[PDB]
Design a protein around this nucleic acid. Sequence first.
DNA 1: CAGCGGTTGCCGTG
DNA 2: CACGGCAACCGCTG
Length: 496
Amino acid sequence: VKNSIIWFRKGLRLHDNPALLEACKDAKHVYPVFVLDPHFLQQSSYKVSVNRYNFLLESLEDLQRSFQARGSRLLVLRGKPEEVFPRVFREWGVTQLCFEHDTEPYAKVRDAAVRRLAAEAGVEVVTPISHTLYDTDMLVARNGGAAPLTMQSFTKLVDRVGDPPAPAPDPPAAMPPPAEDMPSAAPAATGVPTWQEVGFKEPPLTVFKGGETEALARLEAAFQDPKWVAGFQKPDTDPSAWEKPATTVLSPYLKFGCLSARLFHARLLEVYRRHPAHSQPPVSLRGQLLWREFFYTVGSTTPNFHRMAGNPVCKQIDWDDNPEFLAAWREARTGFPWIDAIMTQLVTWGWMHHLARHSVACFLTRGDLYVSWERGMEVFEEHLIDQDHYLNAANWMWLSASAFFSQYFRVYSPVVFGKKYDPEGRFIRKFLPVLKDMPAKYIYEPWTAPLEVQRKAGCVVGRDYPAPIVDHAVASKACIARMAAAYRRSKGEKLA
DNA sequence: CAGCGGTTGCCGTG
DNA sequence: CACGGCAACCGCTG
Ligand SMILES: Cc1cc2nc3c(=O)[nH]c(=O)nc-3n(C[C@H](O)[C@H](O)[C@H](O)COP(=O)(O)OP(=O)(O)OC[C@H]3O[C@@H](n4cnc5c(N)ncnc54)[C@H](O)[C@@H]3O)c2cc1C
Ligand SMILES: [Cl-]
Ligand SMILES: [Mg+2]
Ligand SMILES: [Mg+2]
């Protein structure tokens, strides 16, 4: 007899789920599992937004629905995997455990443990690749032992390898339920809790909802206009667009695996086949899926990837320890509306357009504050609903000119940048209510408004909104000089 | 045995 | 529409 568990971590979907399909073959009972640490939020050292947490829960609710509609259901087991699995293996009489492979530093530790624990209860463990497009261990082997370090050579490499695998077949229409009278599988014990029930006091303000169904819905919303998909160029999108965001906002879905990377890709190749004049990497929409892939690939094969020290791809830079600047940046009180609006959108939505991420990330690091990119990653990690270990680390290294990118004099202006997309300040007005009546002339630089305009608007600097914490021209030049010196030093160490 | 090309800056100038 | 400045970048290509 075959009794299996299909363990969800990422890959919160039924489509393109090889791990699910293998867990269903010749099976008497399948137990769909999500393991939930109930004492997660009480581990003081790191914080998590109710926005990210609830997005997960909404996705788990979407899975529960998908399984009820096929006879089975989702089991939200409470505890730590290394505790929970040993019991339910023995209890449920488990022969097989299937999950989607996960290349993150922590997931490898966790999965090494669960594999050992499976062996000690006679449990077979099958873990297909399906979160990334390719098997990244393969991509590295094919390149000769090391992950590419430029996108140009990465694009060649995947062209050589060929198209990523197709999305897997849709799963069974009806599924074997779990065996009845198993106390760990009791519906009173295994329900999907609400944000209230896990101990959050403030409600989630985000406009994007979790779940496979939303994910596929938003996928169809994107392919509504195949002209747009074919002609997509990432640098030409608008970071001020909030009502109709100027990119797909598939990132939260791809992060949790509500959407299948391979499906999205497969759908792009269909469109590109019918529109031969389509955009190419690195700017194309496929290019964006390959950016994700490129950073998973390098990130997963690089020691200490999410830190500066001991990271072989990362420039060693003299970043200042500066809590007042960091705290101001974090708390959306830098006194530059463009920045503060973005960092407020971060907190209230958990998503901003990439160029808005560029604005605030540059400003923290080499642009203005000279604070370590690690501190910025930590803030994003707390708030982003699409927060992804490797992509966040990689992009923070990119924007601080620490890896992948080294033209550090290309500093974004916190005044001018968004001004050219949104000169009325509709984004600033949306996310900084306090400036809602400040005339457009001064909305990006309210310290330049004369005191009468401030009082009329209902927004006096130093009272209703903070004064800018630095002079951009002085500070950005100060930082450039520091980066130049830091590059000279690591040029001198290199000859050794 | 040294170039080619790079997802997303900006200002002052002519 | 395009340069020089910032200050001298760098991995990949046989
Ligand atoms: C400092 C910083 C931190 C970031 N942190 C994250 C993060 O934690 N998680 C995250 O998913 N993205 C991150 N990004 C990348 C990018 O900002 C988002 O992936 C993108 O804005 C999401 O919108 P979208 O899905 O509409 O992208 P689209 O332009 O529609 O692209 C489609 C998909 O391609 C992938 N993609 C797009 N841009 C990038 C990129 N620069 N790097 C890697 N993959 C990409 C995403 O999975 C995305 O859903 C970060 C960028 C910066 C500068
Ligand atoms: Cl130039
Ligand atoms: Mg060239
Ligand atoms: Mg000028």
